[PDB]
């Protein structure tokens, strides 16, 4: 925007005082009008870009507020909304013109291949887990939590 003050826009000079100090009114008003049109257009361009950028910032701020409410104040069931992993808790940190969230997540680290089954027959009855899944270590059947071998 400041650089635009250096443009002539068709005028004999970009410096308004240099136009006024050398030419009398009648034609000088024309030369000034050329600069007014160009500089006014420059401001309109600047303001339009700022309004669009401001809309972008507002969307980001709304997202940040949403995360603050549903991650720091609560616990998020939304996948990858507050970082990768199963969300536990988050911590806000301030930053210049922004906010930084530290997302604490639970990530499975080591796994084993187990044989499974959807149900077990006993006396003709079909037994299903109340919680967890059925696993076999190759000789014995166990019931264990879905997200942690126990």
């Amino acid at each position: 925007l400041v650089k635009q003050l250096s443009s002539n826009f068709g005028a004999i000079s970009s410096v308004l005082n240099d136009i006024l100090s050398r030419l009398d009114k009648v034609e000088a008003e024309v030369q000034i009008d050329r600069l007014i049109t160009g500089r006014l257009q420059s401001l309109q361009t600047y303001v339009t870009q700022q309004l669009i950028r401001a809309a972008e910032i507002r969307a980001s701020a709304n997202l940040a507020a949403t995360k603050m409410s549903e991650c720091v104040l609560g616990q998020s069931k939304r996948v990858d909304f507050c970082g990768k992993g199963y969300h536990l808790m988050s911590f806000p940190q301030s930053a210049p013109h922004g906010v930084v969230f530290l997302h604490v997540t639970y990530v499975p680290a080591q796994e084993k291949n187990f044989t499974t089954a959807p149900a077990i027959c006993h006396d003709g009855k079909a037994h299903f887990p109340r919680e967890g899944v059925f696993v076999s270590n190759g000789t014995h059947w166990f019931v264990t939590q879905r997200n942690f071998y126990e």
Binding site: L102, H103, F148
Partner: peptide
Amino acid sequence: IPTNFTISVTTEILP
């Protein structure tokens, strides 16, 4: 089925 776990911390930066 996971047998162990790790706690990770990630950083999300928003304007």
